[PDB]
Design a protein around this ligand. Structure first.
Ligand SMILES: [K+]
Ligand SMILES: [Mg+2]
Ligand SMILES: [Mg+2]
Ligand SMILES: [Mg+2]
Ligand SMILES: [Mg+2]
Ligand SMILES: [Mg+2]
Ligand SMILES: [Mg+2]
Ligand SMILES: [Mg+2]
Ligand SMILES: [Mg+2]
Ligand SMILES: [Mg+2]
Ligand SMILES: [Mg+2]
Ligand SMILES: [Mg+2]
Lengths: 58, 159, 172, 51, 185, 222
RNA sequence: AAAUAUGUAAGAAGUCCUUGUUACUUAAUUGAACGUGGACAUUUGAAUGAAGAGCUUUUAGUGGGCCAUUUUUGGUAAGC
RNA sequence: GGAAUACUGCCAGCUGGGACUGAGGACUGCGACGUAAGUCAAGGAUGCUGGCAUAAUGGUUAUAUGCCGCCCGUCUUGAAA
RNA sequence: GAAAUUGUUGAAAGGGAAGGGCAUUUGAUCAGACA
């Protein structure tokens, strides 16, 4: 006995029962994947402006 | 059997246009991309390095990284009951700025000027775009323009 | 389609900055109402000129009453229509009191004799024949003879009651 | 507890819309219109009765 | 028929009442239902909801966690409120005066608060002193600290802990967690 | 606590002053319609008298009724019918006309009938079947206190201002129309006037834009 | 080189000024990325809609399908 | 040149007949009408009259008449088979 | 001393099954409610 092999019937109906939702934008994305040479500097950059505001607000 | 290679079905897609083969023009390389910019993807066929997969042809994302000869674009791709968030590393031939965002930016300067001028003028603004409203009345003259009477024509073969 | 009326319609593209004041085209339609009459106009302007209801505008839609409602005339109606096979032309001959009545018979007649529907017919030109002896057809010409008299044999009598007591006669 | 209709029931009409009291008094619904005798131009009548 | 957009006869998915059959808990709920209606300030809505929460959603608030909330600027003299248990700590060698209001105290936490000249108050005495909820500071224990949520969301490249009884090598450290044994995850 | 004839007189005296405002407004809105309608009929004769042709301002208002029932709808018209609040048969609501909204109606031609409503038709709908939205709750519009409380913010303090705002298509249309729960009409007391509903009006049907004949249709279903 | 179907944008997580932070970048405190301080508010920037928006845990049945309009490959065709 | 009548539309114009329904339970409100005391068709029915007080109405059961009604359980895309 | 199954007595129906659903006629039978 042979089967029925493939279809996509009812697959688009199933999909919309629960939305098809977007993945939520965030203020501040991850620096995973970003140029290492740039990050290396940006770490040291904020340490300075925090210490500048810490010494300012003392 | 079946065949699902990385560039299958791309006979006419990565083709090079008619009378536009050969070297890419220098204004392609002299354009400066920054983190945040919107860009449309369109794969040049001559440059084999840094190429996108056939899916991202015609998609438009945001930049997130910039490095020696490439940019990081970030696209949304749909799969099932969901959208995943996908990170590309394309060379700069296969990319160009979205002119829809550049249209928007210029309107922001227009609207800020209207509000700045409205305060100096004296109250009221109304700065939203209204869609095409239904048209008003008019008196169409017959002065040197009398109506031309028409009727349906009979069938002739001419073959 | 329905009990007809006659309408006048006029329209003239939309106006533009490069070319203000277009040309005004006009037609005479037969319909049951204005809404069908406006539609027929745009149907017949699309068969001739480079226009549609998106690009166009209607200017004036006016009813045309009959000039002499109670006077007998002899109309000559041209018509173009689709059969199952090809698409032909004709010249029928109608006799009535008004133009709108002649069009109301012509549609009823083409449906009986040819199985031509409303969709499949274009009334090209209804024209009143002023003079006598300008009548090619025979079935209108019989009635144009002088001192015309004819009986109505076999008279029937629609009853209210189911049964009847007498037994009926067909005299007149 | 029970929705009464204006249009009919003249009280629940007058609960709303107090002008309905004076609308009836001065009739209005059958206002006599002024009557000028303007004539259509020579072109309009010609273009109407045409081929 | 209607073309229904949403689900019909959907319950709200919120506890209207405590699942407990505790007698004295219901009398606190019978009090704060009255205050939350006939007052105004949202303090009484928040305290009411907290009385319905399950054990897992009312973690214990340490006596140190109260002290670190009072080190804040301005919040020296505010009557701290906790809808749950309050626990002692042996990692602090000083502790301020203050007045705590809660469902429960441990023998050690009550002893540590009174030794520092303070006062432990029940939630019905809090309502009498502060009816609209004034000069108050609500605190909540750390929910995700619980061990059960280590395991939630276990998959590949997730960093989430397997469900496992015995540990040590030869208990899930070979083919799956390293290059040398096939692949890493 | 006196109350009985202290607090009571003040609010009677206060609510007496609202009718004064409601009278002159309706008297003003009464002369606005008729003089506007006279000039539209005058302008037609002046152009005829001179030579020209007058063409009216197009309609900025249509009344739409769902003709088809629930079953067997493709997912694009079915979505629009929900965005125009037409989720059951013989339900209907007003629409402001732009290009955004015409291109909607074109998608739903075969399942609805619509056209250009009059004063009288609106007057009868809003009186007979006038309901409003309050915390969802479909509340009947049997008094003005109900409308002031909800729609005072945007102007509008009596039931005729609601009709005026709908008919002229004012500034606060969106607020005033969305207030009105979609109209639950009956089937038409004279029948549909055709053998088969589901063709276009132009082919002896019901659906699509029948222009000014919607009034006769609505007046029976209401 | 259509029609139908398809990606992105239409603002506060935003726009403009002011001059700080750096081991990155520049011939050059120039740029770059995140900032302090100040200016801009409910016409806050197309329509229509919104029995709320979002998140977590856990577990059942199912994994033989068939039909209809339009597009269609195999086949002379088929309730294939 | 002066009238009339249809056709389409409007009236917060007038008025006659028929059918079904009468939820609710001191008071509270919006209003009308009156110079005032009051009155009202105004947040859902009151008034009057008769006959019967028992198998008279009502319930159950058997039959009769009109139209409807395949044998359950099962596996299956599909069972009255 | 239940049911399947059976006998006698009493009521009923019955032109190639019987049984069921909605409504009423008719026949048998029934409490309540009336103070
Ligand atoms: K027995
Ligand atoms: Mg299978
Ligand atoms: Mg296979
Ligand atoms: Mg290579
Ligand atoms: Mg009838
Ligand atoms: Mg029919
Ligand atoms: Mg399987
Ligand atoms: Mg098969
Ligand atoms: Mg049968
Ligand atoms: Mg089988
Ligand atoms: Mg079976
Ligand atoms: Mg015995």
């Amino acid at each position: 006995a042979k089967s029925k092999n493939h279809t996509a019937h009812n697959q688009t109906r199933k999909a919309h029962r629960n939305g098809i939702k977007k993945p939520k934008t965030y203020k501040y994305p991850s620096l995973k994947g970003v140029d290492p040479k740039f990050r290396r500097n940006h770490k040291h950059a904020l340490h300075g402006t925090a210490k500048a505001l810490a010494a300012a607000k003392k | 059997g079946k065949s699902h290679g990385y560039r299958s079905r791309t006979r006419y897609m990565f083709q090079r246009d008619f009378r536009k083969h050969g070297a890419v023009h220098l204004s392609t390389y002299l354009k400066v991309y920054k983190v945040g910019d919107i860009v449309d993807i369109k794969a040049n066929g001559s440059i084999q390095k840094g190429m996108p997969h056939k899916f991202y042809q015609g998609k438009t994302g945001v930049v997130y990284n910039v490095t020696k000869s490439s940019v990081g674009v970030i696209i949304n791709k749909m799969v099932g009951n969901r959208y995943l968030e996908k990170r590309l590393n394309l060379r700069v031939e296969h990319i160009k700025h979205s002119k829809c965002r550049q249209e928007f930016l210029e309107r922001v300067k227009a609207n800020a000027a209207k509000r700045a001028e409205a305060k100096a003028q004296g109250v009221a603004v109304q700065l939203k775009r209204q869609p095409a409203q239904p048209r008003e009345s008019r008196i169409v003259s017959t002065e040197g323009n009398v109506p031309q009477t028409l009727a349906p024509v009979p069938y002739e073969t001419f073959i | 389609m329905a009990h007809f009326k006659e309408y006048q319609v006029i329209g003239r593209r939309l106006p533009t900055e490069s070319v203000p004041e277009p040309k005004l085209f006009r037609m005479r339609i037969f319909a049951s109402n204005e809404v069908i009459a406006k539609s027929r106009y745009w149907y017949f302007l699309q068969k001739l000129h480079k226009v549609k209801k998106a690009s166009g505008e209607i200017v004036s839609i006016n009813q045309i009453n009959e000039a002499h409602p109670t006077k007998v005339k002899n109309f000559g109606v041209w018509v173009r229509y689709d059969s199952r096979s090809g698409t032909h032309n004709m010249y029928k001959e109608i006799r009535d009191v008004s133009r709108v009545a002649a069009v109301e018979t012509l549609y009823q007649d083409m449906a009986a004799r040819h199985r031509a529907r409303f969709r499949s017919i274009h009334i090209l030109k209804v024209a009143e024949i002023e003079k006598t002896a300008d009548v090619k057809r025979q079935y209108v010409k019989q009635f144009l003879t002088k001192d015309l008299k004819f009986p109505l044999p076999h008279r029937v009598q629609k009853s209210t009651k189911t049964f009847s007591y007498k037994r009926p006669s067909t005299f007149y | 507890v029970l929705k009464k209709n204006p249009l009919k029931n003249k009280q629940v009409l007058l609960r709303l819309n107090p002008y309905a009291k004076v609308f009836a008094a001065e009739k209005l619904g059958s206002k006599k219109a002024e009557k000028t005798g303007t004539k259509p131009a020579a072109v309009f009548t010609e273009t109407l009765k045409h081929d | 028929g209607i073309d229904h957009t949403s689900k019909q006869h959907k319950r709200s998915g919120h506890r209207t009442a405590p699942k407990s059959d505790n007698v004295y808990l219901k009398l606190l709920v019978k009090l704060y239902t009255f205050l939350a209606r006939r007052t105004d300030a949202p303090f009484n809505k928040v305290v009411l909801k907290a009385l319905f929460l399950s054990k897992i959603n009312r973690p214990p608030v340490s006596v140190s966690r109260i002290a670190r909330a009072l080190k804040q600027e301005g919040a020296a003299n505010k009557t701290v409120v906790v809808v749950g248990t309050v626990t002692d700590d042996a990692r602090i060698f000083e502790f301020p005066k203050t007045t705590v209001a809660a469902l429960r105290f441990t023998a050690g936490a009550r002893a540590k608060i009174v030794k520092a000249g303070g006062e432990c108050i029940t939630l019905d005495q809090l309502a009498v002193r502060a009816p609209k909820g004034q000069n108050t500071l609500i605190l909540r224990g750390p929910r995700n600290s619980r061990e059960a949520v280590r395991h939630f969301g276990m998959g590949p490249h997730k960093g989430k802990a397997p469900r496992i009884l015995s540990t040590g090598r030869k208990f899930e450290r070979a083919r799956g967690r390293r290059r040398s044994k096939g692949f890493k995850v | 606590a006196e109350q009985v004839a202290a607090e009571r007189a003040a609010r009677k005296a206060a609510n007496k002053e609202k009718r004064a405002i409601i009278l002159e407004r309706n008297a003003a809105y009464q002369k606005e319609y008729e003089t506007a309608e006279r000039n539209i009929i005058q302008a037609k004769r002046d152009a005829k008298a001179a030579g020209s042709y007058y063409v009216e301002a197009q309609h900025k208002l249509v009344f739409v009724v769902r003709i088809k029932g629930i079953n067997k709808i493709p997912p694009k018209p079915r979505k629009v019918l929900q965005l125009l609040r037409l989720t059951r048969i013989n339900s209907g609501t007003f629409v402001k006309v732009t290009k955004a909204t015409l291109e909607l109606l074109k998608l739903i031609e075969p399942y609805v009938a619509y056209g250009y409503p009059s004063y009288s038709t609106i007057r009868q709908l809003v009186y007979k079947r006038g309901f409003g939205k309050i915390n969802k709750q479909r509340v009947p519009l049997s008094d003005n206190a109900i409308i002031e409380a909800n729609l005072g913010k945007y102007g509008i303090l009596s039931i005729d201002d609601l009709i005026h705002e709908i008919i002229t298509v004012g500034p606060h249309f969106k607020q005033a129309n969305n207030f009105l729960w979609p109209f639950k009409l009956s089937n038409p007391s004279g029948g549909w006037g055709v053998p088969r509903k589901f063709k276009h009006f132009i082919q002896g049907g019901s659906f699509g834009n029948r222009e000014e004949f919607i009034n006769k249709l609505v007046k029976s279903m209401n």
